[PDB]
Copies of this chain bind each other. A is one copy, B any other.
Amino acid sequence: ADYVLAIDQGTTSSRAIVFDHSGEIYSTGQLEHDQIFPRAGWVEHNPEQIWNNVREVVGLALTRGNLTHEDIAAVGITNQRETAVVWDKTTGKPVYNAIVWQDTRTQKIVDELGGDEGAEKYKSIVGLPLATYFSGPKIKWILDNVEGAREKAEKGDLLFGNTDTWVLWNMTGGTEGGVHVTDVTNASRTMLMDLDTLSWREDIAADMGIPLSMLPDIRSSSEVYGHGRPRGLVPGVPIAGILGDQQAATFGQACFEVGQAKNTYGTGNFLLLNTGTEKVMSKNGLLTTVCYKIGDAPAVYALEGSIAVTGSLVQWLRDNLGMFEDAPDVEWLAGKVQDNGGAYFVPAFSGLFAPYWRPDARGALVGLTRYVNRNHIARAALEATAFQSREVVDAMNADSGVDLTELRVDGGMVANELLMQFQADQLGVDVVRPKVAETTALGAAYAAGIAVGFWKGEQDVIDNWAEDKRWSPSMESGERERLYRNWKKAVTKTMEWVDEDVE
């Protein structure tokens, strides 16, 4: 077997990618699944469509690469986190659609669960605030809303799973031999797992009215969970790796050492920092979570931060204000000027931490003078993505003493030299861009190949890890701080106006 097959079961689509020992793409296949909105704030996925699509991309990837299951040494799985699936273990049929992490129907349940200020109720144990994103409250919604579900869960007839678990169950035979398992990274996103013991917590489960029988067996992120069902496309093939999507991209970037972090650039940004075997609890409102766990080796933990508006800023300037209608890539406008021209963008929800720690939907644009033009505005818009990233990094550093040693990056925006160099300048550490952009799928492959010996372990992966390039800090140190301070000041004053803003 010369290849490892990764399945990335994402939010909007699912793809299979076949990798070789070097970490290079051999063949791929991809399909979208429906985003279902039964009503406002509700976001659902049809679980069967997800399975049949996954079934199909695998076939697609093999066919394109002229491969046979005989060529696959292992299958790795990565998935959109938090999305909740509840199905019958006997009929195999879901009792309701998968409730996506984007869904907000559980706001009320989340508010009752916490009680008059209780969002932080479970943080010390599970590392998460009570929010609409996480699985637990979603399972509770399914048990309080669906006819009969709770009684059958009581009986032990219902299974819960993130889609890693849903995909794994179907790939091992479903109602015939299906294994009900999840890894530590995905379990850390449900609100039910104790970060220290890596086990389900009975008290939190009871609090949410969730029978323990619905919960899958928590295992590591790298070990043989099972084998491809006999009559499928990957008959006999070991399925030996699972990592939540962001943890997988982190793993595919080879952020194996303390201080290494991965920043993903999209409409919004996600940043995870490897804090080693030491678990760090945030004082800045950040998430604590599991980065990965390779078999019997100790779990490696992480701090996770998110930024609501990064790449979507420039997209809003275009679709809402009608700017840049002439230029597709804004980088080429920002490059026509030397500076932000005194302009600063206070993106919405940028007021993450100080002085209030209360992100708001209202943003601003300050420092406009007669000289300022759209090239400056393009420049400042890119800077705000970097500034926000820096403020999440400073929060992480303040919480650990594990200071970001370097940033590895993925996402569409990693193709912007200006942004990337400025990101390095602002952070004062190197910024590395991998040669393979699908870090999410690559992480799932590394996790699975390690478990079966296709790769010998973490060090061997580093040896086969190739980078595209890296940017090193070069900006005048004084200019580096001036920009950052003026920006944090802008954020502050903007939040002050917002408090007194009577809408």
Contact = CB atoms under 8 A, between A and B. Distances in A.
Interface of A: 316, 320-326, 342, 348, 361-370, 372-374, 377, 482, 485-486, 489-490, 493-494, 496-497, 500-503
Given A363-B369, A366-B497, A493-B496, A322 B320 contact: no
Copies held by the complex: 2
B502 A497 contact: no
B486 A374 contact: no
Contacts of A323: 321-323
A368 B362 contact: yes
Nearest to A364: B366
Nearest to A377: B321
Given A367-B503, A486-B501, A489-B501, 9 more contacts: A316-B370, A320-B372, A321-B374, A322-B326, A342-B501, A361-B370, A364-B368, A489-B497, A490-B497
B320 A374 contact: yes
A373 B320 CA distance: 4
A485 B326 CA distance: 37
A324 B322 CA distance: 7
Most buried by B among A316, A321, A500: A321
A373 B323 CA distance: 11
Contacts of A370: 316, 320, 348, 361
A480 to B, nearest CB: 13
Contacts of A369: 348, 361-363
A10 to B, nearest CB: 23
Contacts of A494: 366, 493, 497
A359 to B, nearest CB: 13
Most buried by B among A324, A485, A493, A503: A493
The 7 closest A-B pairs by CB, nearest first: A493-B497, A364-B366, A320-B373, A363-B368, A365-B365, A321-B374, A361-B369
A370 B363 CA distance: 9
Contacts of A377: 321
Nearest to A485: B502
A364 B363 contact: no
Contacts of A368: 348, 362-365
Nearest to A372: B320
Contacts of A324: 322
Most buried by B among A322, A369, A502: A322
Contact of A362 (B322, B342, B482, B497): B342
Contacts of A502: 482, 485-486
A176 to B, nearest CB: 47
Nearest to A308: B370
Contacts of A342: 362, 501, 503
Contacts of A503: 342, 367, 486
Contacts of A493: 493-494, 496-497
A496 B321 CA distance: 27
A340 to B, nearest CB: 10
A325 B490 CA distance: 29
A342 B368 CA distance: 19
A363 B322 CA distance: 21
A366 B486 CA distance: 16
